[PDB]
Amino acid sequence: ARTSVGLAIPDLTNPYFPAFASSVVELATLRGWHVVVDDYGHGGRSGLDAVEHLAPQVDAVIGYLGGYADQAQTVLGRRPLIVLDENPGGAAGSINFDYQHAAKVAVAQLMDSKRQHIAYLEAGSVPCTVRGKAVAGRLDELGASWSLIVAEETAEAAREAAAAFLREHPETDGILAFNDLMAAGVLKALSGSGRRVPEDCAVIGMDGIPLGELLSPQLSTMALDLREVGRAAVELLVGLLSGAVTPGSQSSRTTLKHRLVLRESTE
Amino acid sequence: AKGLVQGARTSVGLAIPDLTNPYFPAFASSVVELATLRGWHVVVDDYGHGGRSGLDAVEHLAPQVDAVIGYLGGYADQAQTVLGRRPLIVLDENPGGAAGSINFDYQHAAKVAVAQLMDSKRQHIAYLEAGSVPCTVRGKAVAGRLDELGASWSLIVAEETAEAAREAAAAFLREHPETDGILAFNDLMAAGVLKALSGSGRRVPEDCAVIGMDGIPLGELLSPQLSTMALDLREVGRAAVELLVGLLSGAVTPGSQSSRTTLKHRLVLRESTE
Ligand SMILES: OC[C@H]1O[C@@H](O[C@H]2[C@H](O)[C@@H](O)[C@@H](O)O[C@@H]2CO)[C@H](O)[C@@H](O)[C@H]1O
Numbered sequence: 001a002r003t004s005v006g007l008a009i010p011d012l013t014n015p016y017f018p019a020f021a022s023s024v025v026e027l028a029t030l031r032g033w034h035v036v037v038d039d040y041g042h043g044g045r046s047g048l049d050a051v052e053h054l055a056p057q058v059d060a061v062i063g064y065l066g067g068y069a070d071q072a073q074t075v076l077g078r079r080p081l082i083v084l085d086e087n088p089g090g091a092a093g094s095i096n097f098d099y100q101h102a103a104k105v106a107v108a109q110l111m112d113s114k115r116q117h118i119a120y121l122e123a124g125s126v127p128c129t130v131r132g133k134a135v136a137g138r139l140d141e142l143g144a145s146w147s148l149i150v151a152e153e154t155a156e157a158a159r160e161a162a163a164a165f166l167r168e169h170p171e172t173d174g175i176l177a178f179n180d181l182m183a184a185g186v187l188k189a190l191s192g193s194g195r196r197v198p199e200d201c202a203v204i205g206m207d208g209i210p211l212g213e214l215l216s217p218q219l220s221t222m223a224l225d226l227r228e229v230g231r232a233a234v235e236l237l238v239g240l241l242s243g244a245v246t247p248g249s250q251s252s253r254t255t256l257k258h259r260l261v262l263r264e265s266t267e
Numbered sequence: 268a269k270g271l272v273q274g275a276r277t278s279v280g281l282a283i284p285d286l287t288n289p290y291f292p293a294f295a296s297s298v299v300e301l302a303t304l305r306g307w308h309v310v311v312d313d314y315g316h317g318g319r320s321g322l323d324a325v326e327h328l329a330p331q332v333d334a335v336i337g338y339l340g341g342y343a344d345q346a347q348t349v350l351g352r353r354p355l356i357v358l359d360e361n362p363g364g365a366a367g368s369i370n371f372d373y374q375h376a377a378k379v380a381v382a383q384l385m386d387s388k389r390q391h392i393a394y395l396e397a398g399s400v401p402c403t404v405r406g407k408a409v410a411g412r413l414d415e416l417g418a419s420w421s422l423i424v425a426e427e428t429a430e431a432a433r434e435a436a437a438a439f440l441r442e443h444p445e446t447d448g449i450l451a452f453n454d455l456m457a458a459g460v461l462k463a464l465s466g467s468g469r470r471v472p473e474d475c476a477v478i479g480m481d482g483i484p485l486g487e488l489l490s491p492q493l494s495t496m497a498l499d500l501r502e503v504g505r506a507a508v509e510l511l512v513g514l515l516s517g518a519v520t521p522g523s524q525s526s527r528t529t530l531k532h533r534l535v536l537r538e539s540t541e
């Protein structure tokens with residue numbers, strides 16, 4: 001019997017997650033391992049439910065658990081859990097992202113284009129997300145005149161919110177979106193409103209999904225090298241299973257950075 | 268005791284060949300939605316890695332599932348043999364001995380997509396096939412239909428990616444600047460084509476019309492928005508899950524005519540056509 005790894009993701013509809021999955025599955029498969037994916041964005045299921053479903057079939061789990069790191073590691077006992085993008089707590093391992101760095105770099109690009117009227121579009125129902133608070137922190141630190149927009153995390157939801165906001169605030173000449181999915185919605189709002197990109201208003205996303213290269217204009221984004229993210233998660237898993245890495249230690253907590261990828265949506 | 272989750276649950280395996288063609292995540296999500304709402308556990312095996320085949324995915328899934336729904340890359344027959352009486356429902360291929368099958372009417376889709384272009388009086392139509400003469404099923408169906416109409420059309424072939432399709436379209440548009448209509452194998456490849464047309468200063472639809480296939484949500488985000496022969500993925504999922512219910516209940520006999528369902532694409536007109 002070969003090593004089996006559970007992969008838990010909150011949906012397949014946000015294109016980040018299938019790209020994340022594909023990367024992890026690619027590298028795990030080349031180690032000769034099996035991977036089973038549980039998409040839990042359905043029927044009110046949670047990150048904890050995903051882990052409970054997978055544990056009897058797997059020797060380990062990697063996933064976005066939506067807060068349930070502690071309880072999930074407990075369900076797993078001595079099988080390692082590697083959580084992404086959350087407080088690791090009692091999890092055996094962790095992969096996080098330097099949002100402060102990302103916030104800094106992304107704002108810088110808009111500042112370099114002397115953008116006077118900036119909006120940040122947040123995923124939600126004041127900023128609520130980790131990346132949200134970083135961007136807001138950096139914008140307030142610089143003294144930029146900026147506004148917060150909030151929308152559910154879909155393209156359509158982001159378009160509608162942006163479209164409305166542009167009517168109330170037509171001067172807006174720079175927009176940072178929570179992610180590339182929402183960013184695609186923003187672009188459409190600008191398109192529909194008759195504004196050119198980047199001339200009348202620039203747009204920067206976050207994630208670096210392939211979708212960005214197919215949009216018109218192609219989308220500038222704070223990208224994550226998904227080969228690096230997967231590699232980080234699999235090697236960390238190797239260490240934890242070999243015992244090279246002690247569960248819960250410093251050496252089991254990794255942080256990765258976004259790289260700015262400039263495309264057509266900025267000048 | 269009484270607080271617990273009750274009923275030992277049915278377990279379904281979903282085999283997909285990759286997660287990189289946006290069609291499959293959309294397909295998978297739909298199936299996981301419906302299955303989950305029946306109280307089923309689902310596991311997805313993306314087998315587009317390590318040289319693995321659809322048969323490998325079924326071998327992996329079998330011991331931990333009661334049934335498989337999947338795109339199997341031609342291993343339908345061998346996979347059902349592995350599964351024994353555990354039902355396999357295959358999509359878009361010759362099901363062989365598979366317990367159930369869902370396929371699509373590519374002739375109807377060909378006729379509707381082509382009608383659209385004829386109605387806009389496009390004079391120089393190209394079809395972009397996924398590949399390395401038309402080799403795919405829908406590919407043959409479209410050729411058949413255009414040959415039948417006496418239209419003067421060209422064939423383009425590329426690997427099934429956006430970039431490969433872009434690369435191939437651009438090369439073709441140079442030797443064939445007259446090109447005013449393009450049918451793409453699917454929406455992913457179409458997105459490459461839009462890029463090539465844009466990069467060649469050709470307006471869409473005005474100078475060239477583009478129609479894809481699949482109806483992935485991406486079409487609504489491209490500029491121009493992509494007209495396509497669309498599948499309702501709700502309906503495709505519903506047909507798969509319902510068929511499985513019939514097979515597991517015994518209401519549907521494995522291999523019977525009633526275990527083979529044919530679905531149809533619907534034309535969705537967006538920006539990319541006149
Ligand atoms: O890690 C990159 C992805 O983050 C996802 O959002 C996370 C969020 O950052 C985290 O704080 C927690 O709330 O889980 C979320 C996933 O449900 C984005 O959805 C995705 O687009 C990536 O940016």
Ligand SMILES: OC[C@H]1O[C@@H](O[C@H]2[C@H](O)[C@@H](O)[C@@H](O)O[C@@H]2CO)[C@H](O)[C@@H](O)[C@H]1O
Nearest residue numbers: 284288290338340359360404453480481
């Ligand atoms: O079912 C629609 C999807 O088909 C996928 O291609 C299929 C192909 O049609 C089928 O004949 C067989 O060869 O398997 C292929 C997938 O492994 C497309 O890739 C996808 O975009 C949909 O159109």
